[PDB]
Amino acid sequence: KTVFHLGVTEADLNGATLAIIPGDPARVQKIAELMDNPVFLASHREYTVYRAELDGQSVVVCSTGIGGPSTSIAVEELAQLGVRTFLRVGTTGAIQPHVNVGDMIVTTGSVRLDGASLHFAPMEFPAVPDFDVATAMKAAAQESGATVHMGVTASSDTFYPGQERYDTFTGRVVRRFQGSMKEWQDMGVLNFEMESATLLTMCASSGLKAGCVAGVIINRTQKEIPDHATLKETEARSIKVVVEAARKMLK
Amino acid sequence: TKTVFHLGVTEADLNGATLAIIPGDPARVQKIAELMDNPVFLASHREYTVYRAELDGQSVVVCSTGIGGPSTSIAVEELAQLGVRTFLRVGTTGAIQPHVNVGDMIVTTGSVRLDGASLHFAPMEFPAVPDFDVATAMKAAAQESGATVHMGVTASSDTFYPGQERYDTFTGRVVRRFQGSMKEWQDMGVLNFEMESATLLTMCASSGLKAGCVAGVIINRTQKEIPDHATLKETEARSIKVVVEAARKMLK
Amino acid sequence: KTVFHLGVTEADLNGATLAIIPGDPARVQKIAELMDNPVFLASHREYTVYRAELDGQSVVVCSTGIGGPSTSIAVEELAQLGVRTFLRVGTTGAIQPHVNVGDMIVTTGSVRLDGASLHFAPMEFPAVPDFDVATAMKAAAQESGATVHMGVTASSDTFYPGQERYDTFTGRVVRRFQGSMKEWQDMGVLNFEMESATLLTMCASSGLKAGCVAGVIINRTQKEIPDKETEARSIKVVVEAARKMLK
Amino acid sequence: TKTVFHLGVTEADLNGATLAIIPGDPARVQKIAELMDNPVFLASHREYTVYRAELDGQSVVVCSTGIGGPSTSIAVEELAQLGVRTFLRVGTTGAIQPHVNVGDMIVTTGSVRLDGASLHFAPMEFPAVPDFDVATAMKAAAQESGATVHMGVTASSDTFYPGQERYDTFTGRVVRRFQGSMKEWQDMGVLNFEMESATLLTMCASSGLKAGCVAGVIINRTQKEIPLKETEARSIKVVVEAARKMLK
Amino acid sequence: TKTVFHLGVTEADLNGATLAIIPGDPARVQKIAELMDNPVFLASHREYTVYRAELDGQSVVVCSTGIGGPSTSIAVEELAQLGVRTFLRVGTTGAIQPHVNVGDMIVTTGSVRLDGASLHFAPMEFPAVPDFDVATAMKAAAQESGATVHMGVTASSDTFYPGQERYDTFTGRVVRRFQGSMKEWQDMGVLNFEMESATLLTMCASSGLKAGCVAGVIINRTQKEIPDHATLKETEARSIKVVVEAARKMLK
Amino acid sequence: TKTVFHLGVTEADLNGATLAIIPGDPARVQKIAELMDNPVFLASHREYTVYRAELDGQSVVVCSTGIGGPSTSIAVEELAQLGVRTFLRVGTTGAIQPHVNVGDMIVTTGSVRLDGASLHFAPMEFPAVPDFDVATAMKAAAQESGATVHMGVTASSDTFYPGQERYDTFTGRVVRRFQGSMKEWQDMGVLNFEMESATLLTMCASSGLKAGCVAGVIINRTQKEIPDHATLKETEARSIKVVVEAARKMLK
Ligand SMILES: Cc1cc(O)nc(O)n1
Ligand SMILES: Cc1cc(O)nc(O)n1
Ligand SMILES: Cc1cc(O)nc(O)n1
Ligand SMILES: Cc1cc(O)nc(O)n1
Ligand SMILES: Cc1cc(O)nc(O)n1
Ligand SMILES: Cc1cc(O)nc(O)n1
Ligand SMILES: [Cl-]
Ligand SMILES: [Cl-]
Ligand SMILES: [Cl-]
Ligand SMILES: [Cl-]
Ligand SMILES: [Cl-]
Ligand SMILES: [Cl-]
Ligand SMILES: [Cl-]
Ligand SMILES: [Cl-]
Ligand SMILES: [Cl-]
Ligand SMILES: [Cl-]
Ligand SMILES: [Cl-]
Ligand SMILES: [Cl-]
Ligand SMILES: [Mg+2]
Ligand SMILES: [Mg+2]
Ligand SMILES: [Mg+2]
Ligand SMILES: [Mg+2]
Ligand SMILES: [Mg+2]
Ligand SMILES: [Mg+2]
Ligand SMILES: [Mg+2]
Ligand SMILES: [Mg+2]
Ligand SMILES: [Mg+2]
Ligand SMILES: [Mg+2]
Ligand SMILES: [Mg+2]
Ligand SMILES: [Mg+2]
Ligand SMILES: [Mg+2]
Ligand SMILES: [Mg+2]
Ligand SMILES: [Mg+2]
Ligand SMILES: [Mg+2]
Ligand code: NA
Ligand code: NA
Ligand code: NA
Ligand code: NA
């Protein structure tokens, strides 16, 4: 069978039922090459797709683009082609003083500051990961030697006002989001990103297994501009971790 | 030095406890406490019966919540004022999936917020999620008891009747919001209904408290057969054995 | 035949079609003994049930527990057993400076700060008492010599943040409820409690008659935490209101 | 002193009135005023016609509201600026219960807020509830007139057509929110539909003003969609007697 | 043959008109009608005064709406039942932007739905948007008059007082939703407040009817100076001249 | 050097451009740029490919948005930080009206906000509407190309599948909110579906930026999902010529 956007067929996946889904198309090859026999399948729009083999089993690596909407297309179309387990890796900004740049976060639930999640389940439904995937991600992250936090992630449809950034063209933030950083901090939320609410809600309500692991590249209470060597090390460890989490999920 | 308004206990009464087991039914409090060492009755007011006990040398509180988020929210708050930081809920549930059997255990990984009290702690966007350590301890304890364990989403309703799409009622009416809702939750993979977890999990996850929920399955909306009496007795006993073992794992 | 939670049958109620529904199971016997031939029927969880006779007619007294959810179960199961009129009594915190401890309030409508009401009617629907019950409660309260206020009650699913209390473990209140006590005060709301929105909405949308009378035990302009007489007077009033509802 | 922006009257014009009767139709204002003593025309602008009269020696205002919450909210606000504290709404209505007959009276004990203006005074959780004294006076006046009187909940809609689930319309369609709504309100025991009570009652109950509504039934929606003389005449006699009871 | 319930007119009374000019004030109806040929009084009931006239030989209806979406919705519906398909709203307005002057005209490109009646036609997500041809005709007519014309967003409120964040009122109270709202709309570029456009535009755009709104500015929430009688008289007269010219441009 | 977080370009790179053409697909950026003078590649990062070109002597930037409001919102914000004030969206769309044929063009006059990002700029009541000059320019350019052009409302969804009521999916399920929604939008006169306009139009209209959307119809949902290749190619080629001519009209 074919799909509308991803440009791959079921045959291209060689029986893969697990996908690693980074955001950045450029990260796809980097992840694939941590496994055996990486093969470029397709690139169209924000969707770059590779296959590789992990302990003899086919695994697909597919970028999502930025945001719930583009993520939702990739997950749906991969599911049409037989994928049932989705491991999200990406970078994130921490909002708690105790979470340091270079730490890792495994999301136990997401604050749904998105729109696409509502296209799968009403707001009352929890944006939570599959327990096996979260468990595998925690184990892989801890085994790497990283400092790992389990907790709630705020997942926003914007990078700017929905994360209460004021250093912008207008410098304004709509009422809903004024004072919101402080509120999430007080409620113990660890970090911000832009895809987990959609991913987790879609999967948890559709019989798909999903989880999210992230490297902390900035801390909002500190500075916006990351140090290059620190960022590189964090990014490299994250992709090693997500591949090990995939290994733990294979049956 | 204060005595909290509803529970009628003081901090000193808890002998340093930082963990509470919180069943719904006041009559179950003594039953849980007696699985531990040196159980002592502290107080009973309204739906709140409170005992203390000792588990591997550490003080633990057992406190009933009553039915529903509102009465649960009072117990959790007043215990937190007195130093309790971890809350392990144990209780009965009805399953709504055919693959879940009477006698099985469910550990909630997140709750559908069909309640009102959760909104008094966090807006609806916030996830009603357990602490990961508590959920992990509950899964391990449940598996070690020999039970079949399901991890998944629980629908947490402010009513027993229309919010669980029951029609066998005085009016036989279910408001628009809840018509067809059972099938919707079933199709979304929800395991069960109960009436306190959304409040508990949202309150704790947004307030720096650790919480989780484990439940023995005593009825299944999709199975017409009458649950076996012996199985029910065994399930009640196993549930509370499991929650005490989960507490042991949290205090280690 | 025997309802799921309350542990009583229709026969146990001896034809009663009116219930007095306090919150605390311990107050059930106290109310029943204000009437004739009180009989203990059952106790389970927060639900203690008695029957008694008032001017020769059977009346039920049944506790609700705290909150809309446990209240909704009691009302439903009593209705299954033939009860059609529900008189809520309890205590409350006033938020207006002119409403004093010891005064009584009869709710004319509730601010729906609960969840269970939404399981019976959408938010647009008014949480309002049956007019005959409200009329009987006002008459009973006034005839007792009490100072009586008719007005709006804020009915909250929490005792703490939803009533904008800050002497709490977190010492914080979510955005929705920050500044809310002053807002309700400005809007003329009289008091806070925790069951009326559920009770009134459920009954007004289900062909049941309900109302709420409450004795004031704290004024929130004075302090947050409450410290016998007000309770005793309140239950005498609700029994007289029941007398007025009997046909 | 000031002349209010829309109503075109001053506080002095009202001769100390603290109670207003507020029908919808400007043409009804003189008809209500003439049931009292010394009626005098004060002003007419847009849908707002204003008279003063005397009832048992006390000044009373009669002021039309126009159709809907928005125009009602202006009249109530401006009258309150000029000292009015009690508002008695009279009008006609469509019943949705089969046992409520044309010619019956309804006194609203609470309104379903199917309007927008109520939200400009209180959030949706707040009850659209009358003042208890006004509702009590209206019930007594209605009964004393010999009318069959119903106390209960009224659905108060910002539209006459889709919000009252009428289908004999240009589009013949009703938006999702209102499809099946008449049956739902019927099942919930709602008595009737009209268009101003949610705004009036919410505004007043949240602003330290006393308000109530009484209405004569001119159609039963179990019978037909499209709808009077004797019902209107009896309704205004009733509201004037309710006013008398409030001034005593 | 039927006579519509509120407006008190029949289809035959409209003499084939498919376009209506809909001012708010019943007293303005005759004034607009007299700008055209052969004006004829049809009916007056409540806030609804109805005239017919002829514009370049074609029948045009002029019908007042009263204040607010609810009364407007009745007029539009009943006129549509009688064959009217195009609705041109005219009035005068204040403005909330300092660059908009008394005497300028505003053509609404979209409305902030601070009303209730719009929701009786379409859910809140739906845009309160004019028909493009009507908006185009109104802009052309307004500009041809020599006035400075602003195309932009209008805030359409179910109240004159709290929904426009007015504090000079009986209570001085503005509910939370509307506290700080004026500044918010100003910062978002909203031009003005009025009380009917959200209902009108949403109703029509979701019902196969063509609608638009044009207004002369009579006050500005942000300027010190008070406009003189002459400017206001000129603005009122220009607004109705403009709407009649917009009608001319819409005729086929 | 003024820099931005995602786009990888500086203000200097844009050579004073105040207008951007913003297609969805990065591959379409060079195709649009080459219709103008001196196109130069600036950067490519993630879904964002950026070129500069010159149109009648004025610098213009072409920048892809990616799929969806969230990625669109980043591009628009960062371009605005670098001085861009006018945004012309071009793309493809699926029509839902039987009278709107494959190969026609649509200029959006307002969007149904079935997205989340719009709410991060303005509450739901605010209209997702284009700048009137941009919409006018797009209509003229589209007409001048010989296309059949429709002006009207567009449904703008955060999903391609359930939010557009597609059932031929992995689960075959559509959440309650969206069941029956296609028919509802059809009945309300909505022309088409796409996934970025609600965010774009709301963000810009509430932030002092001018925006509009023009689209070629590549499928009609009442017909078939699989486009014919030659027809699609013709439609896509015409759309990019049209958006460049609309830009010319805006800069005149
Ligand atoms: C990397 C990153 C940082 C940040 O602050 N927010 C989001 O969404 N992503
Ligand atoms: C035990 C049980 C069963 C059921 O179906 N629902 C709830 O809340 N509890
Ligand atoms: C007795 C009481 C007092 C108070 O302040 N609030 C509630 O809910 N109950
Ligand atoms: C008179 C009347 C009748 C009816 O059915 N609805 C409304 O609003 N008014
Ligand atoms: C004339 C005018 C002015 C203003 O400020 N608001 C409304 O609705 N109308
Ligand atoms: C091209 C296209 C077609 C369609 O049906 N929907 C969306 O969003 N885009
Ligand atoms: Cl990434
Ligand atoms: Cl229990
Ligand atoms: Cl009590
Ligand atoms: Cl009643
Ligand atoms: Cl006190
Ligand atoms: Cl009238
Ligand atoms: Cl009839
Ligand atoms: Cl006018
Ligand atoms: Cl006439
Ligand atoms: Cl249009
Ligand atoms: Cl594109
Ligand atoms: Cl091309
Ligand atoms: Mg602000
Ligand atoms: Mg799952
Ligand atoms: Mg005690
Ligand atoms: Mg239904
Ligand atoms: Mg936590
Ligand atoms: Mg705050
Ligand atoms: Mg009733
Ligand atoms: Mg008697
Ligand atoms: Mg027809
Ligand atoms: Mg429908
Ligand atoms: Mg009052
Ligand atoms: Mg405030
Ligand atoms: Mg249209
Ligand atoms: Mg055709
Ligand atoms: Mg065709
Ligand atoms: Mg359905
Ligand atoms: Na994207
Ligand atoms: Na309870
Ligand atoms: Na209709
Ligand atoms: Na009006």
Coordinates of C-alpha atoms in Angstrom, one line a residue, chain D residues 87 177 193 230:
Chain D
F87 CA -37.2 45.2 37.9
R177 CA -25.5 22.6 19.6
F193 CA -38.7 29.5 25.9
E230 CA -56.5 38.3 26.5

